[PDB]
Every structure is written in C-alpha cells, then in structure tokens.
Design a protein around this ligand. Structure first.
Ligand code: HEM
Ligand code: HEM
Ligand SMILES: [C-]#N
Ligand SMILES: [C-]#N
Lengths: 100, 101
C-alpha cells in the first residue's frame, strides 16, 4: 500500500474553517477504487500544516483518482478556498503494526 | 486520538538497514498503554525523510511512553544507529474516514 499526504498551508486562525469544510466534504472520496481511507490531522507541534493522510492499495489507484475523480471531488462549493498552499508527500508503507 | 510522527533523516542507501531494524523491533511498543499502532513510511517523492507514524489514544498516553518505556524500547542494540536526525511532528486527529478497500 501507499500513503499520499497533502500537507496544506492555511493562514493563522483559518484552521477551524478548513476543518469545517473537510467535515462537510468528508464523504467526497467515497466509492473510489483502491481507496483505503484518510485522516485529517490538525497540527499541534513541529508542523504548521494540516496533514491530509490518504491511504491507497497502490500508486496506480491514487493516480487514477487524481486524474479526474479528485478534481470532481474538490469542485462545486464555496468560492475562495482557505488553503494558501499545498505539498504532496508520497510514501510506500514498509511496516504496518497494530497495538496489541 | 493523536498522531506523533517521528520524521527520520537517514544517509543515502541507509534505507534497507533502517527498515530492517524497525522490522526487528516492531513489537517492542506493541502492548504500550494507549498505543494504537504505527506505520513505517518510506519516502518516494516530496520528502526525503522516513515517517514513523504512531497513533495514540491521547497525548497523555504518548507522553507516558516517551518518559521511560520509549527510552527502554530504543536501548540495547547496534552501537551505530542509522539516523542522522529526527523531528517529532505532533497532530490531533480531526477526521478518520474509511474507504472502499
Ligand atoms: C490525497 C491527495 C489530495 C490532494 C493532492 C488534494 C488537493 C488539494 C488542494 C491542492 C487543495 C487546496 C486548493 C483547494 O482547496 O482546492 C485541497 C483542499 C481541500 N481538499 Fe484536498 N486533496 C487531496 C485529498 C483530499 C481528500 C481525501 C479530501 C476529502 C475527503 C479533500 C478535500 C479537500 C477540502 C475540503 C479542501 C479545502 C477546500 C477549501 O478550502 O474550500 N482533499 N486539496
Ligand atoms: C513518536 C514516537 C517515536 C519517537 C519520538 C522515537 C524516537 C527515535 C529517535 C530520536 C531515533 C533516532 C536515534 C536512535 O536511533 O535511537 C529513533 C530511531 C529508531 N526508532 Fe524510534 N521513536 C518513536 C517511535 C518508534 C517506534 C514505534 C519504533 C518501533 C516499533 C521505533 C524504533 C526505532 C528504530 C528501530 C530506530 C533506529 C535505530 C537504529 O538505527 O539503530 N521508534 N527513534
Ligand atoms: C486535501 N487536502
Ligand atoms: C522511530 N522513529
């Protein structure tokens, strides 16, 4: 599996609004082939960006989503997005261990 | 829940050895109170650091682990650690949503 993190930059104090929008649009990625889920992570220390941690069965499944479905998923709402920037951080899962 | 990511810097070519050592000690933190699990993430694009993504029921549970058990968990092995640096990135989980798979 792979992990693709969108690290989002938002103005100071814009956090609550960003979170609000994600919550409202939490289910935009439903039904996507190869999608394993995502977390929205609020920064507390060591980072100032929100991490949108998305999980996929393969890089192929992610690239398929990015090439259309993601664009549709981000369309159709309130103008003026909150983010001032974003960086895509891409990983392969080496280990995945549960807490026993 | 909270997420604590240890972002590890390793020399070129040091990847496999780091991964090896994590695999060997993967189950040292397994029964820690409040520990929900972890992933070791190998960078492919946009980052050069390994991300060690650890999940905890609370900041309190993580802090208890760090103040002793974590030190114990990292002790007693190869006299030459691989990493050249590390930064702890700390988050609160706002949303956690499942998928198709
Ligand atoms: C994993 C790869 C992803 C990429 C590369 C990506 C891309 C982006 C980018 C560039 C932005 C800033 C510009 C904009 O707001 O349109 C953004 C914001 C946003 N994205 Fe994503 N996204 C990803 C995942 C997700 C997922 C999984 C969701 C929701 C389930 C999501 C929902 C949102 C929302 C709600 C915003 C803020 C929109 C606003 O401020 O009005 N994104 N995304
Ligand atoms: C937020 C959680 C964690 C923090 C702050 C942390 C701290 C550190 C630091 C500072 C290093 C670099 C110095 C060293 O090699 O000892 C390191 C490396 C390492 N950590 Fe962690 N750690 C965390 C989670 C974990 C977990 C969950 C595991 C295993 C299940 C783990 C296993 C290892 C291993 C195998 C190394 C490399 C040791 C070597 O190269 O010889 N760490 N950790
Ligand atoms: C979505 N970021
Ligand atoms: C462990 N980092």
């Amino acid at each position: 599996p792979v992990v693709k993190i969108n690290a989002i930059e938002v103005p100071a104090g814009a956090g609550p609004e960003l979170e609000k929008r994600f919550a409202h649009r939490a289910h935009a990625v439903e039904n996507s082939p190869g999608f394993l889920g995502f977390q929205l992570l609020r920064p507390v220390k060591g980072e100032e960006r929100y991490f949108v941690v998305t999980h996929w069965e393969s890089d192929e499944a992610f690239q398929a989503w990015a090439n259309g479905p993601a664009i549709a998923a981000h369309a159709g709402h309130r103008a003026n997005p909150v983010a001032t920037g974003a960086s895509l951080l891409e990983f392969e899962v080496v280990l995945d261990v549960g807490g026993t």
